[PDB]
């Protein structure tokens, strides 16, 4: 769902508009969310 | 697509009459306009007389208005150019034509589609 | 697996016979109704053309896959590019019926004409081969889908709708002359 | 007023494989009934499974003959639907009209010698990675193979595995580049007793998970 | 914005038999009432069933005359809506505008002789497979037939069966090819007593399961 | 309802597409259905 | 249902888009599904 | 009749970024499975956060060296994704394809001197409003800054604030007009003991609320 | 896009025959119309004979109707102009052409797309 802006459903079936993925995980999202913040050691504000 | 078969040409002398005919090869259900073009010796082709297939709407040239007469046979799918009281200037090569694409009167002598090989008419004096 | 060969029963061994694993398959592209549903060319058109499917090229996709069946049934779609009007008469019509506008007649629009025709043959199925004659190498004259007519027809395309095939026949590939396999050029980007 | 629309550009033209229909001109037509008509196939791979057809070895024979020689290599052919041995097959005749394939390919070996003639055969799958195939069963015993002798049951089916890097393979070998992308299949004659001119007929059919993928139309027309 | 559309190619042109309507220009018009107007027909085959019309034998007569001869074959005509005998019929006049047909065709035989004149007739259906029809009732007794004499009831109806290979038949005979695709119908004169110039009128109507299939427009116009 | 093959209703009202009949019987259908069949007299099959 | 990819119903009735079949069985599907597999004789894995 | 429409003018033409789709021509295609394929990124700013890349100081080095001089200004660069120091960064390589930005920009300082070498550094953010940046830490102590010495932990991250008048800033400096629209960043060397040739490596990554706004395509092609 | 390769030109004398050929560079699936134009010495180009790719529909000029013959090879994707019983007036520069855009018979000699460099045919007496 990127760069499509019509509210109405498609006229053609999903089987014909694009291919179908089969089966048998965002790394950098988790790698950025698991970043360190805050401080290290003690703080004297 | 369509080929035209001409008949009736030949040689006459001034004052007589001739009858030209032309039948197309296929009998499709169109509104085609059978016409007649003539090319005098050492001059360029020019329009003589046309007729519509649906009705008998006939066009003519200023040269041949009272003399020539064109008709159509709905049954046999033919068209006839009855040439009368020929002049020595009527010597030329007479061509038929089809003009299938548009059938309006105002444009009835400008743009034809299938010609078919011309006949020879050489009137003497 | 070992079996009696002369009995002609079908035998399908697996890779499980030596530890393997049969994988899941999808055969949507070798479906009979799917593969026959594409427009294919008819390269001999006349001012008057009788729509006979055995006039498709024998080595095309649909042409060859149709020669690989004894009987068939189908509706039809045609794409005609003509001058003037286009008349269609059904199966069995006189040839003189093609000059009248009581029959389906299409007044030509700009690019071409795209119609859908039914199945009008008097038989339950049509055939690609016939062993014998039909009067009192050549199929019966009733093996057609009708006829079309225009002042001149430039191209004709046909498409089989709701296709059904029966009794398969041999389907051959190009022969290998002396090689170990038939090698040909395959598309690959430039540079 | 009336509904306004945007006649988009790029849309509208005829594609010869498009999924939409035409508009009818002749209504209310009924067909003659063809209920329970015999011999219908709705999939090409069903016929390709149930009906195997012959291979074409040297001199254009569907069979390999035992040899009175020191050579124990009966025949060898590439794993390719465009091979010289499969040129006359139904599997190949179908596969010529598709871009890619995947799955199993079954080989059938029918022995047509007399009763007083015995033999023992071997077939090995030689995946790619060697430049030349092996010509000794002692050396081809290290591939995937199977052995079988002759007896009451005169047929034997061996199933070629689909082993490769990609999930699909081309059904056409590209150019004069050598060393077929898939392996070879090598038939050997382990031994034979009093089998001088007896033959072994070979044929091929599609496997349980065989598949052809992208329809094309590649022949010169 | 507004709804985008694809003006498809191949669609739009006028077909003279298309199933769609035009757009009106003159609203609110009421017709004069024609409730219970007599003599309405909504099907041509209803009229073709209820109203039989005459056949046309030699000299253009609707009847065959008994013959003072050794010949017992009154008339014979092909089972064809394009036959010479059916050229003046309503069934044929309708059937000329269709491609195919199937079903029953009824023949009616009305005896118009005096009271003191008796006769016995026979009609046989001769399906195709012989080159020439039979000319003796003894030889045509092996087809499907019926016999009837003259008495109080002066009419007789015989129903021609639709027997063929295909489910439908053409309503037009193709070319100068001989031996009509369907059979013949042969009328015989078994015997007669004191019937020298008495006639038998023949007419034809459609059967119970008769049917015409594909409308055409075949006449030169 | 003869020779019309669209499932969707008409865009224009019935008052404008065609005229309207007012009031104040198929003869040949009944004349054919009331036809005689069977036999006459006795039968010996 | 082969090679048609629109979700919306057809604009024309079924009586006009194509012909209608009347009545009064896939052989090769059953002929392939009824194929022999497994082994013959005994097995010593 | 049929539905009338108004083919509007101005609508229909192709825009290279329009939000509508095309119509298909090749149905029923299945891809090979790529479940749990490693190393996927769905946002460029995720990679820009997690992976910092080096700055480019004089002589094209990712680091500044302590100086045996009276000058305590190691390096100074404009707060601009188009700066000379950020020319080789991933943040800048991404930001070249957008019109505007807003949010935090993090700097990382890794000390790579020996154990027997100490130092104390300082970084200050000098917002716009002065003509020339300060060159003494005593004078740049009045901006927003931070100090840090060397020890066990060899990294230090300082976060440049987004302080301006407008809610967004251009990611490209307009013309030879001087005095960068945003401030400068000045790195100082407060003191050092026995650190003659030891270096301090600098790199930059995106902050927690960094953002790029309007996609463009500005390079000569 | 498409380039045309001509072959078979040369020199003959009156009464002999020549065979011109032309093969296009790409084998796209179109309905193109291969034609032949000739340009006599000191005169302007003119149409000689054309042929359609789908069928063998052939057009001709009034000059060369019974003498010349044009054909097409579906397999090799070629077209051949068999010139017979040459006249000394047949000396000219012969050009082929493509005409991909429209393939109707009525317009089969008016507007071609790709020409390809002409061949030289100089018949002697």
DSSP state of E31: P
Query: Which residues in chain H have Cβ-Cβ distances shorter than 8 Å to A20?
Result: 28-31
- Residues B100, H169: Cα–Cα separation, whole Å: 68
∠H16-H18-H21 over CA atoms, to 5°? 105
Residue D182 tokens, joined: 């898939």
| Of residues A6, A19, A37, nearest to H30 (C-beta) | A19
Please, which residues have CB within 8 angstroms of residue H211's CB and are 6 or more apart in sequence? Answer: H45, H101, H102, H103
Sign of CA dihedral D96, D98, D100, D104: negative
| Of residues C17, C75, C168, nearest to G19 (C-beta) | C75
DSSP state of E24: -
CB I35 within 8 A of CB I96: yes
Q: List the subunits that have 3+ CB pairs under 8 angstroms with F.
A: D, E, G, H
Instruction: Please tell me which residue of chain E has the smallest CA distance to C80.
Output: E10
Query: Which residues in chain B have Cβ-Cβ distances shorter than 8 Å to C153?
Result: 1
CB H41 within 8 A of CB A28: yes
Please, which residues have CB within 8 angstroms of residue B92's CB and are 6 or more apart in sequence? Answer: B38, B39, B40, B41, B121
| Beta-bridge mates of residue C164 | C73
Phi (first) and psi of residue F11, to 5 degrees = -75, -30
CA distances from A36 to A29, A31, A32, H157 (A): 14, 10, 9, 11
Inter-chain touch G3–H27, beta carbons under 8 Å: yes
In E171-215, at which residue ranges do the beta strands (DSSP E only) sit? 184-193, 199-206, 211-212
3-state secondary structure of G43: coil
Residue D24 tokens, joined: 């009818």
∠D12-D13-D16 over CA atoms, to 5°? 125
Inter-chain touch B30–C47, beta carbons under 8 Å: no
Instruction: Please tell me which residue of chain G has the smallest CA distance to D37.
Output: G25
Residue D176 tokens, joined: 């004069």
- Residues E198, I66: Cα–Cα separation, whole Å: 69
CA distances from H102 to H43, H81, H106, H216, I123 (A): 16, 11, 13, 16, 82
Inter-chain touch D12–E8, beta carbons under 8 Å: yes
> Could you tell me which of G18, H63, H38, I3 has the C-alpha nearest to residue C77?
G18
Inter-chain touch H50–A16, beta carbons under 8 Å: no
* Distance between E166 CA and the closest CA of chain F, angstroms: 28
CB E156 within 8 A of CB E95: no
Query: Which residues in chain I have Cβ-Cβ distances shorter than 8 Å to B1?
Result: 104-106
CA distances from E135 to E72, E75, E84, E124, E193 (A): 7, 10, 19, 11, 21
Query: Which residues in chain D have Cβ-Cβ distances shorter than 8 Å to H3?
Result: 3
Q: From the CB of residue H22, how many other CB atoms can be counted at a distance below 10 Å?
A: 10
Query: Which residues in chain D have Cβ-Cβ distances shorter than 8 Å to C117?
Result: 25-26
**Matching residue, tokens 């069949």:** F37
Burial of D30 (0-12, 13-18, 19+ CB in 10 A): middle
Residue I30 tokens, joined: 């179109």
Do the bridges between strand H184-193 and strand H118-126 make them parallel or antiparallel, or are there none, so unpaired?
antiparallel
- Residues B81, B92: Cα–Cα separation, whole Å: 14
Please, which residues have CB within 8 angstroms of residue C183's CB and are 6 or more apart in sequence? Answer: D82, D173, D174, D175, D176, D177
DSSP states of C24-83 = P---STTBHHHHT-S-EEE----SEEE--GGGS-TTSHHHHHHHTEEEEEEEEEEEEEEE
Do the bridges between strand B10-13 and strand B119-124 make them parallel or antiparallel, or are there none, so unpaired?
parallel
Nearest-10 Cα torsion for C179, C180, C181, C186 = -80
For residues H143-165, one letter each, b for 16 or more C-beta atoms within 10 angstroms of the residue's C-beta and e for the rest, the string is: bebeebebeeeeebbbebebeee
Tell me, yes or no, if F28 comes closer than 8 A to chain E by beta carbon: yes
Phi (first) and psi of residue D155, to 5 degrees = -115, 155
Query: Which residues in chain G have Cβ-Cβ distances shorter than 8 Å to C31?
Result: 2
Burial of A2 (0-12, 13-18, 19+ CB in 10 A): exposed
Query: Which residues in chain G have Cβ-Cβ distances shorter than 8 Å to C37?
Result: 2-4
Residue H219 tokens, joined: 């390079």
CA distances from D45 to C67, D101, G28 (A): 17, 12, 9
- Residues I24, I5: Cα–Cα separation, whole Å: 6
DSSP states of F1-45 = --S--B-SPPSS-HHHHS-B------HHHHHHHT---S-SS----
Q: Where are the alpha helices (DSSP H) in chain H?
A: 44-50, 90-95, 137-140
DSSP states of H61-124 = BSEEE--SSS--EEEEEES-TTSSTTTT-HHHHHHTTBSEEES-EEEEEEE---TT-EEEEEEE
CB D125 within 8 A of CB D134: no
> Could you tell me which of C47, C72, D81 has the C-alpha nearest to residue C56?
C72
Inter-chain touch C154–I74, beta carbons under 8 Å: no
User: Do the two chains B and H touch, given a threshold of 8 Å on CB pairs and at least 3 pairs?
Assistant: no
Tell me, yes or no, if C163 comes closer than 8 A to chain E by beta carbon: no
> Could you tell me which of H99, H77, H90 has the C-alpha nearest to residue H187?
H77
Burial of H27 (0-12, 13-18, 19+ CB in 10 A): buried
Rg of chain A over all Cα atoms, to the nearest angstrom: 22
Inter-chain touch H5–D9, beta carbons under 8 Å: no
- Residues C1, C10: Cα–Cα separation, whole Å: 12
- Residues E124, E74: Cα–Cα separation, whole Å: 12
Tell me, yes or no, if C123 comes closer than 8 A to chain G by beta carbon: no
| Beta-bridge mates of residue D144 | D125
- Residues I44, D179: Cα–Cα separation, whole Å: 59
Using left for φ > 0, alpha for ψ between -120 and 50, and beta otherwise, residue H146 falls in beta
Phi (first) and psi of residue D188, to 5 degrees = -120, 160
Instruction: Please tell me which residue of chain A has the smallest CA distance to H42.
Output: A26
The domain total for chain A is 1
Residue B2 tokens, joined: 């369509």
> Could you tell me which of I107, I90, I98 has the C-alpha nearest to residue I4?
I98
- Residues F45, E35: Cα–Cα separation, whole Å: 49
Tell me, yes or no, if F38 comes closer than 8 A to chain D by beta carbon: no
Residue E139 tokens, joined: 């030889």
Helix (H) or strand (E) holding A27: helix A27-33
Experimental method of this PDB entry: cryo-EM
Residue H19 tokens, joined: 């939000």
Nearest-10 Cα torsion for D18, D21, D23, D26 = 130
- Residues C149, C47: Cα–Cα separation, whole Å: 6
Residue C121 tokens, joined: 């043959």
For residues C28-57, one letter each, b for 16 or more C-beta atoms within 10 angstroms of the residue's C-beta and e for the rest, the string is: bbbbbbbbbbbbbbbbebbbebbbbbebbb
Inter-chain touch C162–G18, beta carbons under 8 Å: yes
- Residues D44, C61: Cα–Cα separation, whole Å: 13
The residue range of the domain holding F16 is: 1-45
Please, which residues have CB within 8 angstroms of residue I12's CB and are 6 or more apart in sequence? Answer: I18, I86, I121, I123, I124
> Could you tell me which of C122, C114, C178, C174 has the C-alpha nearest to residue C148?
C114
- Residues D52, D90: Cα–Cα separation, whole Å: 8
Please, which residues have CB within 8 angstroms of residue D90's CB and are 6 or more apart in sequence? Answer: C170, C171, D47, D48, D51, D53
Looking up residue F1, the CATH number of its domain turns out to be 4.10.90.10
**Matching residue, tokens 């080595």:** C59
Tell me, yes or no, if B115 comes closer than 8 A to chain I by beta carbon: no
Tell me, yes or no, if B74 comes closer than 8 A to chain C by beta carbon: no
- D-F CB pairs within 8 A amount to 3
Task: Kindly report the three-state secondary structure assignment for every residue of chain D.
Answer: CCEEEEECCCCCCCCCCCCCCCEECCCCCECCCCCCCCCEECEHHHHHHHCCEECCEHHHECEEECCCCCCCEEEEEECCCCECCCCCCHHHHHHCCECEEECCEEEEEEECCCCCCEEEEEEEEECCCCCCCCCCHHHHCCCEEEEEECCCCCEEEEEECCCCCCCCEECCECCCCCCCCCCEEEEEEEEEECCCCCEEEEEEEECCCCEECCECCCCCC
Count Cα neighbours of E168 within 13 Å in the Cβ-side half-sphere: 26
Helix (H) or strand (E) holding B5: strand B4-7
> Could you tell me which of D212, D22, G3 has the C-alpha nearest to residue A16?
G3
CB E182 within 8 A of CB E166: no
CA distances from E85 to E64, E76, E127, E143 (A): 12, 9, 18, 21
DSSP states of E114-181 = -TT-EEEEEEEEE-SS-SS---SHHHHTTSEEEEEE-SS--EEEEEE----SSSSEESS--SS--S-S
CA distances from H106 to A37, H90, H145, H185, H206 (A): 12, 13, 13, 12, 6
Q: Could you tell me how many helices (H) and strands (E) chain A has, helices first? A: 2, 0
The greatest distance separating any two alpha carbons of chain A, rounded to the nearest whole angstrom, comes to: 64
Q: From the CB of residue H80, how many other CB atoms can be counted at a distance below 10 Å?
A: 21
* Distance between C83 CA and the closest CA of chain I, angstroms: 8
DSSP state of B25: S
CB B38 within 8 A of CB B44: no
DSSP state of C106: E
| Beta-bridge mates of residue D204 | D53, D107
Q: List the subunits that have 3+ CB pairs under 8 angstroms with G.
A: A, C, D, F, H
- Residues C170, C67: Cα–Cα separation, whole Å: 8
Do the bridges between strand C113-117 and strand D23-24 make them parallel or antiparallel, or are there none, so unpaired?
parallel
């Amino acid at each position: 769902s990127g760069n499509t802006g019509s509210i109405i459903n498609n006229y053609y079936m999903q089987q014909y508009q694009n291919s179908m993925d089969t089966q048998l995980n965002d790394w950098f999202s988790k790698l950025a969310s698991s970043a360190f913040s805050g401080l290290f050691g003690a703080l004297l504000a | 697509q369509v080929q035209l078969q001409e008949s009736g040409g030949g040689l006459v002398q001034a004052g007589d009459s001739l009858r030209l005919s032309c039948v197309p090869s296929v009998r499709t259900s169109d509104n085609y306009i059978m016409g007649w073009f003539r090319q005098p010796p050492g001059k360029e082709r020019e329009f003589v007389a046309a007729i519509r297939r649906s009705d008998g709407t006939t066009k003519y040239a200023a040269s041949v208005k009272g003399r020539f007469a064109i008709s159509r046979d709905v049954a046999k799918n033919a068209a006839y150019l009855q040439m009368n009281s020929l002049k020595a200037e009527d010597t030329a090569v007479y061509y038929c034509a089809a003009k299938y694409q548009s059938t309006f009167y105002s444009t009835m002598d400008v743009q034809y589609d299938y010609w078919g090989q011309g006949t020879q008419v050489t009137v003497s004096s | 697996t070992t079996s009696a060969g002369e009995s002609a029963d079908p035998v399908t061994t697996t890779v499980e016979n030596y530890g393997g694993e049969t994988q899941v398959q999808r055969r949507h592209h070798t479906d009979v109704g799917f593969i026959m549903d594409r427009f294919v060319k008819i390269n001999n058109t006349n001012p008057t053309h009788v729509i006979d499917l055995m006039q498709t090229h024998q080595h095309g996709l649909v042409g060859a896959l149709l020669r690989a069946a004894t009987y068939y049934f189908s509706d039809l779609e045609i794409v005609v590019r003509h001058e003037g009007n286009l008349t269609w008469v059904p199966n069995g019509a006189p040839e003189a019926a093609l000059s009248n506008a009581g029959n389906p007649t299409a007044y030509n629009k700009a690019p071409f004409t795209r119609l859908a025709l039914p199945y009008t043959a008097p038989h339950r199925v049509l055939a690609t081969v016939y062993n014998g004659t039909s009067k009192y190498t050549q199929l019966p004259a009733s093996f057609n889908f009708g006829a079309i007519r225009a002042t001149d027809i430039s191209e004709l395309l046909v498409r089989m709708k709701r296709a059904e095939l029966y009794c398969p026949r041999p389907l051959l590939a190009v022969e290998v002359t002396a090689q170990d396999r038939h090698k040909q050029k395959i598309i690959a980007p430039a540079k | 007023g009336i509904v306004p629309v945007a006649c988009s550009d790029g849309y509208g033209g005829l594609v010869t494989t498009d999924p939409k229909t035409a508009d009818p001109v002749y209504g209310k037509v009924y067909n003659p009934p063809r209920t329970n008509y015999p011999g219908r196939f709705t999939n090409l791979l069903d016929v390709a499974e149930a009906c195997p057809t012959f291979l074409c070895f040297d001199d254009g024979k569907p069979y390999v003959v035992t040899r009175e020689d020191e050579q124990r290599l009966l025949a060898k052919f590439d794993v390719s639907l465009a091979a010289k041995h499969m040129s006359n097959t139904y599997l190949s005749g179908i596969a010529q009209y598709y871009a890619q394939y995947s799955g199993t390919i079954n080989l059938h070996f029918m022995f047509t010698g007399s009763t007083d003639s015995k033999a023992r055969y071997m077939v090995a799958y030689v995946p790619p990675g060697v430049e030349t195939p092996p010509d000794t069963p002692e050396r081809a015993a290290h591939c995937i193979h199977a052995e079988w002798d002759t007896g009451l049951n005169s047929k034997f089916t061996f199933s070629i595995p689909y082993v490769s890097a990609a999930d699909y393979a081309y059904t056409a070998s590209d150019v004069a580049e050598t060393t077929n992308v898939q392996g070879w299949v090598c038939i050997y004659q382990i031994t034979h007793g009093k089998a001088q001119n007896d033959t072994l007929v070979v044929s091929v059919s599609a496997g349980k998970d065989f598949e052809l993928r992208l329809p094309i139309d590649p022949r010169t027309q």
